[PDB]
Amino acid sequence: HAVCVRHAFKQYGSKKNPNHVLSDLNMTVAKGTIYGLLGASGCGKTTLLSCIVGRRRLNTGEIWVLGGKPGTKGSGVPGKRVGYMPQEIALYGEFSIKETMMYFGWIFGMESSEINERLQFLLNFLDLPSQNRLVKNLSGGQQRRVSFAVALMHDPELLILDEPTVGVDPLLRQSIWNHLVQITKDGNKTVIITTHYIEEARQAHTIGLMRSGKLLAEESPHVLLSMYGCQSLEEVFLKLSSWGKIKALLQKNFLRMWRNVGVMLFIFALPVMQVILFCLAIGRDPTGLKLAIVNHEKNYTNQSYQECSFDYGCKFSYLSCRYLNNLRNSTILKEYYPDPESAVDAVKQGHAWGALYFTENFTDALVARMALGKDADPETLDQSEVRVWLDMSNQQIGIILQRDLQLSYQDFAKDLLGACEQNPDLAEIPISFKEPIYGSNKPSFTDFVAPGVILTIVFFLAVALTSSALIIERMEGLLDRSWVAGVTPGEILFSHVVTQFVVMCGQTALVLIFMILVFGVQCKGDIGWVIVLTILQGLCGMCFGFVISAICELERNAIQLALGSFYPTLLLSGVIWPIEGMPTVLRYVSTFLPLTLATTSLRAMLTRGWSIAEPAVYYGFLATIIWIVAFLTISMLVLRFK
């Protein structure tokens, strides 16, 4: 007595439009026979098979398969005692036939020495191509044969085949049926084959016709035909009235992505190129700025030559070419125009960014202004000044232009006095800036954004990898087939965490090497805690993949949910702008985001060298741990009623 079912009541719905998928069902599968299930649709048989295996549960009734209640103690139905061929092809792509057979043998605890014998026997018997050909390269009919061979490997004592012969050649169908009737010859082997084709299940010892969630009849085909008088079976149906399984999953995980060139480029080559582009374009100071200089103290020759010469010692010859020599050569390029009304016309168009317009009386008026004091007449206060018309449409370019012009005057003022034996401190504003406590006097914007780029890449490259992996595998029936083989959900998750941990360590090493060793981003603090924080953000992002994959069943739905929170989090975590710019109400809400307090903590360890003991540093560690726990709890709650 292999399988016994009594009063199996099962239904679907929410007490609004309920569906009675199952009804009062009594079914017995005698041991050592071939049992055929010939239901009309493909839902009742599938539900019954799932309940028999253990992947589903009843509402009322009992099931007694191979000795005990399915999925629990007292029996080994989920494991190496059963053979399950799913309705759909639940094979792994980018796998050779030999690799798939070896993987499934390892899952069942078989020895690798005896796997070769079964592989050769099944290749000869099922008429399959060379073992080195990948599964994805096979046709749609050979994949079913590979699935049948996988289900027939370990010689189980109960075979559950779901339409094993859909489009098999008759010369092979006869051989398959001969093998099936040969293995179940005075032995413990039992077959429970479900099919839609009525005429193909005549060789079964016992036939059970299913309709409206219950078995119409269950007898031998010969008795079924004789007691009703029908010629064929078509007329009869016209009734108007743990170590070893983890190593198997680790190899599969590290080989599924190795054979996908697109996956490797997306998760290993994209962070590297993004880091290179960010360090070469964002945060650098402008360099090719142009100015329209009008110098009326000298003759006009070209738009690129002026012949600005003077004396360096004393006597204050020109004091207009002398100032231009103190201009920063790196950022500002000088262009010469003849008239003040012509340089402004160049600024109006795109030919320049500003105008200077030194007057012809600049030298005589300037020397008469610093040598007079507070009694200077208004006339000398006008002729001794530089008139700058600036294009302030750009905020960042305007800041450099204003800063470079004023800074060059401080050097010019400190050069005039000092060359005449004076005190250079006399040309200083009373507001004196001492040595900065943190940083330097010339900070860079690329150093402010770099901590926000490291954490963003690692966080969002784990959401995409985890959500895609757990959705494709589940929707293709692979997770359900690798559970029947005895792989508990505990080791499915454990093997995924280890696989994701390794790839998030390789990404962290590549990002940190290309950012600090190359392009010279400063790291004042401890590098050990930087690595730990970066890894911790990867696990937080990975835990977000669990929530997304447990909510969305379709791939396209998950990406919208993942992309629908990627953009808002970037604009609220203070990655590209200081967090002090937002309103006070919006500032409080943003501190509770997953990436806000972690970015600030990482920015302090890189720009200031703060240790773990500082309150602003370990707040980023506690914020991630809370979000990791919160993400895990949400996923469990979602799976409770789904």
Next chain:
Amino acid sequence: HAVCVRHAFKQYGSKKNPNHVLSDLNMTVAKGTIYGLLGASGCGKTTLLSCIVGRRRLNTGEIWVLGGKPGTKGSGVPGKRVGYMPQEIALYGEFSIKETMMYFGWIFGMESSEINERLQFLLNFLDLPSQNRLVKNLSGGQQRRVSFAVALMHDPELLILDEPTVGVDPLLRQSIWNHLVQITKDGNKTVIITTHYIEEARQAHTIGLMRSGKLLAEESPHVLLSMYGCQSLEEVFLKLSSWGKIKALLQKNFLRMWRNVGVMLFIFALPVMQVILFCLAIGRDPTGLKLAIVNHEKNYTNQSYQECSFDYGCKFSYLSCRYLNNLRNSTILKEYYPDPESAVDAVKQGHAWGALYFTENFTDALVARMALGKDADPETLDQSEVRVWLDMSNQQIGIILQRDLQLSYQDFAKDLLGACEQNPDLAEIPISFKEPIYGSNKPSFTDFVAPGVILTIVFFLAVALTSSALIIERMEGLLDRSWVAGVTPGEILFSHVVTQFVVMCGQTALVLIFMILVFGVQCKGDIGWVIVLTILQGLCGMCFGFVISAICELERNAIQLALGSFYPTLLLSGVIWPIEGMPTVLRYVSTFLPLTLATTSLRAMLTRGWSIAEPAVYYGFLATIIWIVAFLTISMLVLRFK
């Protein structure tokens, strides 16, 4: 002769592994007879049906179906004269049965009055639920029944069915076969049934057994049984040898988005939430900076109180509480500490951003410095200066603090002289900044990034919509089902462009209204040309979706390619940083990118008010036009060899 195939040859794959799907196939179908095409696998029969309907082309041989070559304007195989039921369920989700019937009737050109009669007849004949139930809410059998009813509504003179009964109830199978026999007697209707059922296809008037790309035997069932002396058929087989379509497509496209709530929120509620968050967080000035002030001219009372009092007229009583009076109240908060050593300790932690430390004799040292100038002793110059220690780890905050500390001294200096009857023009540096030509003296960073945000949202939300729409729809054979119905490829492309153009028109209105009318981003240029440029970027993005959809065949691959180009373009088109920061070599390459010249053109329209006659403005219009053509050419070349 309904169909005449002679000397058919067809090859698939490469030379190394050729695939001879057909080889010297001779087949003839009479008019008014049911024809059954039984085969071992489900690929050669599908290939033959695809060749018959005209989707494919033979490498050698001729086909004459219903009068002439398929799709040659001599015969009307693509259109009303055929009934096609694909192997897969090529139906539209979120469509009621009535809506599906109406859409397919409008495609064929039927009147809405006679579609109702056919719908009511087919609903009762096929035993289907109420017409208001959505297709996606039906089971597999009901969906297949709806697909079968779709092929029977317009009454074609040639029915092509691919496995019409795979899980149909036997009573319904008998009814369907009775109807099929009824419609083909004493008439011109011809039915070609392709099935794996060897025994169910017995009522067909002519059976053609297919094997190895050719027909083993083509004759009547009972004739075959009598000639070969076999009881059943499997024993014999066991031998060892034009505006109505656009209006129908436009309504389908719009209604396919209305019934997807997630899609509407992703393309119409995400840009609204992204614009609002960007305008409230990025670009605004910091307004919470705290400074640790050490004033030794007044007694220490609290950390929040100092009792800063001074005379406003003259006599220069304190000059330390007077300077602090001019400090801006918006950005700087005042804290008081008793010792300079106790103030730096607060800056070293996260309690302050700087220190000031006015000396105990600041008033007399400063007063004696202005009155006695150009000859002040080093003692006075050292005890009349303010010592500022700044935390310069943040570039944007450090700029604000330095700028506000020096701008406040100008107001203090212009108040000290002027209240004593002196001209305030004596307290200005010779570098005099006139009125800016463009912008103002206080620019904003959110105005620099706003032009780049508008283009990025519109361009990159059309790639996602176009690629997904053309990939999911093509994967499930929806294009193949509408092509057989008579919908030319031109009408499919035209209807999608119109639908996308209307979608991108709504997105432009929402983005422009919130950014300009609500958040007050100035538009100094022409508003008409801004809308034109924004729309032109949407078409350019859509054409990039054509390239992605023509290259990739799976959803998970298109987005990796789509996201693989979204990240680099953001860091190379100068959206979040001026293009002047990159090196010259990278600057030349980045110019040719799709969004580089367009962002510059839009920025000059909003920030400067330039018109279309300026070279820097219309260069972004030519860049989009060329990229539109290039993307269309690439998509045609991709489909040429693929």
